[PDB]
Design a protein around this ligand. Structure first.
Ligand SMILES: Cc1cn([C@H]2C[C@H](O)[C@@H](COP(=O)(O)OP(=O)(O)O[C@H]3O[C@H](C)[C@@H](O)[C@H](NC=O)[C@H]3O)O2)c(=O)[nH]c1=O
Ligand SMILES: Cc1cn([C@H]2C[C@H](O)[C@@H](COP(=O)(O)OP(=O)(O)O[C@H]3O[C@H](C)[C@@H](O)[C@H](N)[C@H]3O)O2)c(=O)[nH]c1=O
Ligand SMILES: Nc1nc2c(c(=O)[nH]1)N[C@H](CNc1ccc(C(=O)N[C@@H](CCC(=O)O)C(=O)O)cc1)CN2
Ligand SMILES: Nc1nc2c(c(=O)[nH]1)N[C@H](CNc1ccc(C(=O)N[C@@H](CCC(=O)O)C(=O)O)cc1)CN2
Lengths: 271, 271
């Protein structure tokens, strides 16, 4: 019964493209509001800007305060930067797409944490927001491989793609309020906060090849940083099955050859 | 040569496995033993391999004395020395490692799988090569880490399943008719002594599952118990009752704790 039906809060391609899907299939611009993230400067770059799309397309920019009293508003967080408190809202139609295969890897830096912890797969999960961090009941989840030479930046782009997708898969039943959900288990639940990750990663070479490789490629996301070996930035790590002896470490002009305690060949490419 | 087999290592896995060969396969005369450096020659919370051997007129030797024995079966059962295979005339060199290889190579394997959130572990019979726990897998038996198992419980499961896999496989080892498969690069992990601080400092900005896991991974009373506010902890119980996020309350006999997802932990203080 209110004029505003939906708020998209967050950033990057996932937010912008999801918003474009709703504008095309579901709601007119004047039934939509957005809350861009604090660091959104309105500039299209290696990602699309939600603030810029909103301005371009005459969608009103609001704050949380302005939406708390809108009854029945659908609130959708797509890489939103604020932890909400659900008791502020009259609506209970509050959703998030989280970049991991919940209940694993709640929290932040989820293009880093699964790689660093030796996962072969990750996922995106659509869930209701409750007062905890990525703790709410799951509505849908899509799992996908972390390929053996995927970097954190590669995995991030997979989150964006599969996330956008899981949004489109589910938005109808969310708008109809006909969706199903299930509470998260206690077991397998894991969480990382910013203080658990040191973005200047010091590599522990007394590790297997797999682990050394994981350690490198988990911090490859050039827009933010690259890992450093012997004062050289690394742009790609390649892990092979080839046995080359234990604890190999050789610096060349364009790359390092590395093996860990199990002796499998890594090529770490310089930038 | 008269000597057919060396059993090297410690604890009930080594003693019972030796008793089983002495009963079914070889005479005392055909067996030599290398205890670990720390073997006291008395029974304690585990039986002494040194004592068993001396009690049964099985000769105690060093690695030097066996290198030259043609065709000897060398069988490590929690042995404390990394061998170098080119020292030996025989290539019949075997180990039972207490993990589900290729995961959790190295040490402290009753801690590492719990601390890294595993639901299961395993024992793995493999050939020894020059790396640590790297050689080809001959057999493996996987079993659960129950939700409230401690490191101590895990260890006693390794000794039991470890003894069993020895008994299952030993004839084919004697007859050299066993089969094996090289280990994969993927999923391979390793922990060395320096990776684990046996005086664990709990990170409470984690899930209840992780906090519980941190506690119970260090419960091994013969060595240490984890400490919370100066009380030693003997048992951690994780329930799927929601009690609020980030609870911490101390009582006389226990703590009530929840992490970021709010599930109830009871940490029982040692009596
Ligand atoms: C800031 C930063 C990011 N990254 C990489 C890894 C990150 O997973 C990826 C995306 O970073 P970004 O700052 O957008 O967020 P993130 O930590 O993954 O995601 C968290 O922060 C978002 C604002 C929240 O919406 C997310 N909430 C989800 O339910 C949260 O998981 O960029 C670096 O390698 N280095 C960096 O310094
Ligand atoms: C020394 C020590 C051990 N433990 C626990 C954790 C560990 O998994 C278990 C057995 O201790 P260990 O016998 O020192 O063996 P560990 O599991 O480190 O195994 C390692 O050392 C032995 C001697 C090798 O044969 C074995 N292949 C290695 O994996 O006891 C503790 O909790 N605290 C300790 O201080
Ligand atoms: N209610 C609630 N609000 C949400 C989500 C939720 O699922 N629950 N899902 C999204 C979560 N977004 C985040 C998640 C974490 C942080 C964050 O900033 N974490 C800090 C920790 C802050 C703290 O300890 O509380 C850190 O890692 O250092 C910020 C936005 C959006 N809003
Ligand atoms: N060849 C080789 N020898 C072996 C085994 C093997 O599968 N391969 N299997 C058994 C493994 N026993 C161990 C494993 C690790 C240590 C150990 O002492 N590790 C040190 C690291 C030592 C190092 O880096 O050299 C540490 O963690 O600080 C000792 C005995 C017995 N001997």
């Amino acid at each position: 019964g209110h004029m505003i039906k939906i708020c998209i809060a967050g950033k990057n391609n996932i937010a912008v493209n999801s918003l474009q899907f709703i504008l095309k299939n579901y709601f007119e611009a004047d039934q939509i509001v957005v809350i861009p993230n604090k660091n959104d400067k309105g500039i299209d770059s290696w990602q699309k800007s939600l603030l810029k799309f909103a301005l371009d397309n005459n969608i009103k920019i609001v704050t949380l305060d302005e939406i708390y009293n809108i009854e029945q508003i659908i609130f959708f967080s797509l890489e939103f930067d604020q932890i909400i408190k659900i008791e502020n809202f009259k609506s209970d139609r509050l959703f998030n797409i989280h970049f991991s295969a919940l209940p694993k890897y709640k929290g932040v830096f989820t293009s880093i944490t699964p790689i660093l912890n030796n996962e072969l797969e990750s996922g995106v999960t659509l869930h209701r927001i409750d007062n905890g961090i990525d703790t709410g009941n799951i509505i849908d989840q899509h799992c996908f491989p972390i390929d053996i030479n995927d970097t954190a930046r590669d995995l991030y782009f997979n989150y964006l793609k599969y996330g956008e997708s899981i949004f489109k898969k589910n938005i109808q039943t969310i708008i109809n309020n006909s969706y199903k959900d299930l509470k998260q288990t206690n077991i397998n639940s894991s969480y990382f906060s910013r203080k658990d990750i040191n973005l200047v990663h010091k590599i522990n070479f007394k590790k297997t090849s797999f682990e050394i490789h994981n350690q490198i490629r988990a911090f490859i996301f050039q827009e933010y940083q690259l890992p450093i070996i012997n004062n050289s930035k690394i742009i790609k790590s390649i892990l092979a099955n080839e046995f080359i002896g234990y604890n190999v470490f050789e610096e060349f002009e364009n790359y390092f050859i590395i093996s860990g305690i199990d002796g499998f060949k890594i090529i770490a490419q310089k930038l």
